[PDB]
């Protein structure tokens, strides 16, 4: 199907991406992971998102998440994500065509009592997809949790 | 990877399913759809769920959803789902090994102001996957919305 007009400004996402990331948080010693993301569509004003992570040495699976990105022509966007850990997120924010960036903050995090907010920010940098995930908890204000850079396949 | 012990009681789900369903609700004239569901895993105590629907005549895409099922050996289960419409669900309930059934009700429905609760109930019937989705809204109590039967491929 053709790309819906509302998806076309984010057409640079469409495809599969692979790279690696790092996590760290005040309670949690640093760790690294491999990551794959696929963005796809079926002609609707929605981009399907699917993601998985693995251990770098072995390729052993770690976690997975999936959901849907819903951009609108005013530059607004909402994103819904379900995670293999048992959390859900409703993310809302904006995308910027000139910067090839997407900036999201949670309206809601479901099923995760200690986690309060999650933000997710993407940027295309020299054709690579970079992001930062930030997380707050009851006692820790919003701050970096995950960062990754992925090459387009 | 081997099937995790917590997933093994639900191993009958694993695979791809295709069939058809029907929707109806007091505000909403009946409609029909084709449906495909895949359940998969990667050796963790989680089953990945992915679903799509289409128009019966043409195969034109309708909607999609995806998420994760997390069964536990006490018979409890939680399910998280993100939908292409922009909703999320946290579903909790039980599974019954003798009946090959799964009964879920939402703890949370996110990003959908009029929708209050969703329940989802699955049953294996003569090797086919059947479900019923029920929905409440502010003014309509919980009642059937969707029902479908799918054959295992």
Say which CATH superfamily domain A1-153 falls into.
Calycin beta-barrel core domain (2.40.128.20)
Q: Do B44 and A50 touch (CB under 8 A)?
A: no
CB B68 within 8 A of CB A82: yes
Chain A interface, Cβ < 8 Å to B: 1, 42-44, 46, 48, 50, 52, 61, 64, 66-68, 70, 78, 80-84, 86-90, 107-108, 110-111
Least CB–CB distance from B84: residue in A50, A68, A111 = A68
Question: How many angstroms away from the CA of A128 is the closest CA of chain B?
Answer: 26
Q: Where are the domains of chain B?
A: 1-153
Question: How many angstroms away from the CA of A13 is the closest CA of chain B?
Answer: 17
Q: What angle do CA B84, A36, B49 make, to 5 degrees?
A: 40
Q: Do A86 and B68 touch (CB under 8 A)?
A: yes
* Terminal C-alpha separation, chain B: 21
Alpha carbon A116 to its chain centroid, in Å, reads: 17
Q: What angle do CA B67, B58, B48 make, to 5 degrees?
A: 10
A42/B101 Cα distance (integer angstroms): 32
**Measured between beta carbons, which residues in chain B are less than 8 angstroms from residue A78?**
86, 111
**Measured between beta carbons, which residues in chain B are less than 8 angstroms from residue A80?**
82-83, 86-88, 110-111
For B63, the closest chain A residue by CA position comes to: A44
- CB count within 10 Å of CB B58 equals 8
Question: How many angstroms away from the CA of A30 is the closest CA of chain B?
Answer: 22
A151/A37 Cα distance (integer angstroms): 10
Least CB–CB distance from B46: residue in A1, A70, A84 = A84
**Mutation site, A50, A86, A117, interface B, largest B CB count within 10 A:** A86
Considering only CA atoms, which of B124, B117, B114 is closest in space to residue B90?
A: B117
- Kindly state the DSSP code that residue B13 receives in the 8-state scheme: G
Method of elucidation: X-ray
**Measured between beta carbons, which residues in chain A are less than 8 angstroms from residue B110?**
80, 88, 90, 107-108, 110
Least CB–CB distance from B86: residue in A70, A82, A86 = A70
For A91, the closest chain B residue by CA position comes to: B111
A64/A55 Cα distance (integer angstroms): 13
**Measured between beta carbons, which residues in chain B are less than 8 angstroms from residue A1?**
61
- CB count within 10 Å of CB A64 equals 22
DSSP A91-127: EEEEEETTTTEEEEEEEEEES-SSEEEEEEEEEEETT
At CB < 8 A and 24+ separation, what contacts does B44-47 make?
B44/A61, B44/A84, B44/B4, B45/B4, B45/B5, B45/B6, B45/B7, B45/B70, B45/B71, B45/B72, B46/A64, B46/A84, B46/B4, B46/B7, B46/B70, B47/B7, B47/B10, B47/B13, B47/B14, B47/B71
3-state secondary structure A12-45: HHCEEEEEEEEEEECCEEEEEEEEEEEEECCCCC
């Amino acid at each position: 199907p053709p790309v819906h007009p509302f998806v076309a400004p984010l057409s640079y996402l469409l495809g599969t991406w692979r790279g690696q990331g790092e996590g760290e948080y005040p309670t949690i010693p640093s760790w690294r992971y491999g990551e794959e993301i696929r963005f796809s569509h079926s002609g609707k004003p929605v981009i399907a998102y699917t993601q998985k992570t693995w251990k770098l040495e072995s390729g052993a699976p770690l976690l997975a998440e999936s959901g849907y990105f819903r951009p609108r022509p005013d530059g607004s966007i909402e994103v819904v994500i379900a995670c293999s850990t048992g959390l859900v997120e409703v993310q809302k924010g904006t995308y910027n065509v000139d910067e090839q960036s997407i900036k999201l903050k949670s309206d809601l995090v479901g099923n995760a009592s200690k986690v309060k907010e999650i933000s997710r920010e993407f940027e295309l940098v020299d054709g690579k997809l970079s992001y930062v995930v930030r997380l707050s908890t009851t006692t820790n204000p919003l701050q970096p949790l995950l960062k990754a850079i992925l090459d387009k396949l």
